[PDB]
Ligand SMILES: Cc1ccc(Nc2cncnc2)c(C(=O)Nc2cc(C)nn2-c2ccccc2)n1
Ligand SMILES: [Mg+2]
């Protein structure tokens with residue numbers, strides 16, 4: 001049990017800031033995760049043998065795609081770690097447990113295509129899960145991995161704690177469906193402004209954990225500008241591949257996905273930040289004030305994209 005994971009000085013200190021980049025050495029990322037779990041959760045909460053075996057099976061089930069890959073999985077888990085460490089006393093044992101696991105698994109087996117594309121293509125996954133298609137698939141992949149031999153990292157929870165944790169995870173993963181985010185943030189904004197928001201109302205915590213999963217998922221926009229700008233090339237690599245594929249079904253795709261409309265990415269990044277990202281981090285900062293660093297970095301990046309449009313870069 002005294003087998004504590006350690007990090008070099010720069011990473012040890014920078015892992016605590018919201019804007020940490022996990023780096024380009026892929027073989028350090030399992031340890032950055034085990035490090036985050038031990039400090040967030042405790043070192044007795046997972047059997048190290050089972051946790052490492054689970055981590056490796058999860059990484060194996062992330063594909064080689066430009067954005068929705070293993071690096072994204074770990075990067076979303078680091079944002080979650082930073083929210084939990086900045087809000088120590090607000091979450092329970094099972095909640096810290098489930099959520100970091102939910103972040104690592106949340107895009108399991110992503111092929112790099114949206115829900116819209118799966119339904120236009122008439123993929124069999126669209127027949128099985130008529131809404132939040134990929135997200136119900138991600139949760140399914142998580143349960144299968146948890147049921148492999150030697151992978152059940154929750155084995156020592158009681159039947160009731162186990163049911164509670166799977167349920168925290170399923171709801172955390174379903175929430176990453178951005179189609180559900182718009183609704184969820186509006187309701188949190190209405191509860192916040194009327195002062196009815198009650199973190200004892202389980203239905204209310206579920207909404208808050210939802211918004212946290214949006215925040216962690218979009219956190220590439222909260223990075224220092226060189227990291228955000230470079231991650232934007234990976235996201236657009238995927239969008240343009242989907243657009244290519246839309247055109248092979250004979251569907252003209254939305255400007256976001258058309259590689260012939262690269263000129264409009266700067267203006268399209270403004271609307272994304274104004275319609276999705278800025279409100280996300282604003283409402284999250286209203287509910288959890290210590291997550292303010294994410295809104296400040298998200299606004300610095302908007303300014304940077306405004307500066308691109310004015311040809312100052
Ligand atoms: C889900 C998601 C995650 C990350 C995203 N970007 C990103 C930027 N910088 C660094 N890392 C990542 C983007 C993104 O660029 N979105 C987007 C652009 C436009 C014109 N529209 N949208 C959009 C997409 C879905 C719903 C509403 C609007 N989307
Ligand atoms: Mg996803």
Ligand SMILES: [Zn+2]
Pocket residue numbers: 072076106107176217
């Ligand atoms: Zn994601």
